[PDB]
Design a protein around this ligand. Structure first.
Ligand SMILES: Nc1ncnc2c1ncn2[C@@H]1O[C@H](COP(=O)(O)OP(=O)(O)OP(=O)(O)O)[C@@H](O)[C@H]1O
Ligand SMILES: Nc1ncnc2c1ncn2[C@@H]1O[C@H](COP(=O)(O)OP(=O)(O)OP(=O)(O)O)[C@@H](O)[C@H]1O
Ligand SMILES: Nc1ncnc2c1ncn2[C@@H]1O[C@H](COP(=O)(O)OP(=O)(O)O)[C@@H](O)[C@H]1O
Lengths: 106, 505, 217
């Protein structure tokens, strides 16, 4: 969750960054946070699957597993939302820049 | 069919015999009572080095034709007006003469064109005149029905539309790579001198050898056998019993490199530095790769998969892709990296890429790796700039399904995920792997023990100093290894190693 | 589409008609176009795709297209399909860069009436309707069908049963789970099929498919 919120913050900042060097630094930090997010996703995937398998015979363990599942699902939803919003915003900016008369020919 | 020296090609001979020669075998009385002409052309196509020239030559011999007259594509051209096409006219003279003189009892002539798709492009320069000449002669106002012309080519889809009409090039055939039965039969044909004349030992089992060689082209097996015999005889120098054993065969098989096979040496060079599991991630990543490999091999509908691995610079990304590939056992393995492409012209780049992709579709089973994207695409941020056409070549390629049941996996790596987002290309890819760098001290401990940097005292003290000094260590493996070597070959490990590690993070 | 086919086959004046299929990516447009084509019996049917236009030079692309159009005119009844216009032209958004010549040629070609009362139908497909508005090319088209995504669970169940993937308890479990796990649901059919098939191999039970369907929406 913490990493997802950091990704959202970098998304918002990269929309406004005009210094090319800072934008590059933001892109690389973004790459680091995205990579960490994917790795946590894979780890939780395997660990939760193993916990649900381990809880088959104990209603309390099953309950724990299902709670983890719910929370992980909420995390996934949050990720999806962030991603969608950012895509939609990147579209409006890509519209902004070129919908006007342009610098003199090549 | 097989009494003559051609192995594995069975249906083709039935097909060609039924269409070509069923109208030249029976006595002329019957066929003239049937009033049909004879086929006057044949186009057989396929990858090089499969035996097209051989079959073409043999066809003449079965019909007791005149000796073949032969030419190859690019040599036709000249630079004087009206000389470049006169040659195409020369080749039919003798046939015309004999037809006029004798009549309907003449003996069949044969002509062989090579690399037809060098010159005969779609029309609409010299090229049009060349094509026009060939059309006007191959079927003209004057009847001439004692000839046959044979064509061999690699790319059927650029020959002009008019030569392929019923009347000029009627029968179109494909020659594909040998199967297992083909390889076994090829061995049987090839080792006839050695068998009857008794210089082959009794221990060698050619069935096993056929089972061992995959995607061998059918020509190179000759190379293998002659090399093995040369190996044995040179080893001898004694005339007791000159026998070739399985040893020589194994040696030669090891030596040769097929064209449509694994390119091991590059992939070995890629991972020269060794794979040590300094943390838990490596196992997980490799497991993921193996899973996907299985998915490719076992399915039926998922004939293609696109998989991306991405992460920060210097994190050691490409080596993992290599390791996954080399631990798979697929026959066909090629690698595309900037090192090859450097120095070429743009057209050359696109041509190379196109050919490389086109190659894989022929083999049953393929894995293909791409080294880096921003580099190939000429990205540079200021402006920014890049070569578009290459980008499109890749973009269209990454969606092509193999034309037939053949199967392909494609792997690629990059350092600039976000930039790929921004160009809007990401829709091609199905699954993603992340490769982060080290942010721990015990990891550094594992790598120093594997590299055996120093004795335990130095090791313990440096981990202690970095524990107390750097709290949020974060660097890739590249700088770690090179820095470790630098400290080793330099003096006083604390004096540099600790400082350099701090300065790098 | 059937109505259009009939209308073109029998109308003295209506010699030329141009349709436009547009919709979100992965909605599966080309399949529909092909199905419309196959059930018409029009003797001349031929296809242009970026697939065939691979690795040539620009002029060659022009020559190829021009030849194909020319070939179409020498027959009484004809149908052509054009795949992924906005990709024949090599549109890329940063700049943006694209080739002008091919665009102009198509702009011209789509309007030229065939000679001697011969009959033609043209279909084309796209996934970037907005940029087409922006380039001011939409005048050429006489009508526009729209294809949206699937957006309900019952449809997804229909897809499972046509795939025969589901078991009887499996469908109940998955449908209920997703019914509470996802308020809004919208995906392309292509991705759905991919997911059903990858889920059919490993861990067949409802789990893998449920979270995969989540990981699509
Ligand atoms: N666990 C590991 N995984 C990958 N590479 C490793 C590992 N441990 C050590 N290495 C070293 O990393 C190198 C292989 O990675 P490679 O050179 O392909 O890096 P890369 O990130 O692709 O490079 P680049 O910075 O050029 O993009 C070798 O020197 C290898 O020994
Ligand atoms: N009724 C259907 N409608 C659409 N697609 C279907 C249908 N039934 C099955 N399919 C499958 O889904 C695919 C739809 O996607 P298709 O290959 O047409 O891609 P597309 O969305 O047109 O292309 P692009 O990726 O260029 O946007 C069909 O090719 C077929 O494999
Ligand atoms: N199927 C085959 N049967 C027999 N010999 C073959 C076969 N394929 C290749 N060869 C051998 O390889 C050579 C065939 O040459 P070929 O593959 O046609 O090369 P090119 O196409 O350059 O002429 C001959 O030595 C031939 O005996």
């Amino acid at each position: 969750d913490h990493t997802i919120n950091q990704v959202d913050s970098l998304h918002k900042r990269l929309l406004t960054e005009v210094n090319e060097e800072q934008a590059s630094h933001l892109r690389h930090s973004l790459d680091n946070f995205v990579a960490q997010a994917t790795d946590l996703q894979f780890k939780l995937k395997n660990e939760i699957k193993s916990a649900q398998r381990d809880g088959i015979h104990d209603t309390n363990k099953q309950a724990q597993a299902e709670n983890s599942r719910q929370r992980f699902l909420k995390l996934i939803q949050d990720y999806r939302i962030v991603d969608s919003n950012y895509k939609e915003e990147n579209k409006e900016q890509a519209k902004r820049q070129y919908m006007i008369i342009q610098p003199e020919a090549t | 069919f097989e009494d003559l020296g051609v192995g594995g090609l069975d249906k083709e001979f039935t097909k060609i015999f039924r269409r070509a020669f069923a109208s030249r075998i029976f006595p002329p009385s019957v066929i003239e009572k049937l009033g049909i002409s004879h086929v006057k052309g044949l186009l057989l196509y396929g990858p090089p080095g499969t035996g097209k020239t051989l079959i073409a030559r043999k066809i003449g011999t079965m019909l007791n034709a005149k000796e073949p007259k032969i030419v190859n594509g690019p040599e036709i051209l000249s630079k004087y007006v009206g000389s470049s096409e006169e040659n195409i006219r020369n080749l039919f003279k003798d046939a015309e003469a004999e037809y006029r003189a004798k009549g309907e009892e003449s003996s069949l002539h044969i002509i062989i064109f090579d690399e037809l798709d060098s010159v005969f492009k779609q029309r609409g320069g010299v090229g049009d005149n060349v094509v026009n000449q060939l059309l006007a002669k191959m079927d003209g106002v004057d009847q001439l029905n004692n000839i046959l012309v044979i064509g061999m080519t690699n790319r059927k889809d650029l020959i002009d539309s008019a030569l392929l009409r019923p009347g000029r090039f009627e029968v179109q055939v494909e020659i594909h790579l040998p199967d297992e039965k083909g390889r076994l039969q090829i061995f049987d044909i090839q080792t006839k001198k050695m068998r009857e004349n008794n210089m082959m030992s009794d221990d060698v089992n050619l069935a096993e050898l056929a089972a061992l060689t995959k995607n061998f082209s059918g020509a190179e097996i000759e190379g293998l056998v002659k090399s093995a015999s040369s190996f044995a005889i040179n080893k001898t120098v004694d005339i007791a019993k000159l026998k070739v054993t399985r040893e020589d065969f194994l040696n030669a098989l090891n030596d040769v490199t097929p064209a449509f096979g694994i390119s091991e040496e590059d992939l070995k060079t890629c991972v020269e530095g060794g794979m040590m599991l300094y943390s838990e991630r490596v196992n997980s990543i490799l497991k993921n790769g193996a899973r996907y490999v299985r998915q490719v091999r076992e399915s039926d509908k998922s004939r293609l998969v696109s998989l991306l691995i991405h992460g920060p610079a210097g994190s050691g990304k490409t080596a993992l892709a290599a390791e996954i590939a080399l631990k798979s056992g697929f026959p066909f393995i090629r690698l595309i990296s900037p090192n090859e492409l450097s120095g070429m012209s743009e057209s050359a780049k696109i041509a190379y890429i196109d050919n490389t992709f086109r190659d894989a579709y022929k083999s049953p089973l393929n894995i293909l790796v791409i080294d880096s994207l921003e580099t190939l695409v000429d990205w540079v941020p200021i402006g920014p700039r890049f070569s578009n056409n290459i980008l499109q070549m890749l973009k269209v390629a990454l969606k092509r399904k193999p034309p037939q049941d053949r199967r392909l996996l494609i792997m690629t790596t990059t350092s600039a995920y976000s930039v790929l987002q921004q160009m809007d290309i990401l829709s091609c890819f199905d699954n993603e792997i992340a490769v982060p760098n080290m942010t721990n001290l015990d990891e550094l401990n594992n790598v120093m023990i594997e590299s055996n940097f120093l004795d335990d005292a130095g090791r313990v003290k440096v981990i202690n100093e970095l524990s107390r000094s750097c709290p949020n260590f974060n660097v890739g493996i590249k700088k770690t290894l090179t820095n470790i070597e630098t400290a080793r070959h330099d003096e006083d490990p604390v004096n540099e190693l600790v400082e350099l590690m701090t300065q790098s993070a």
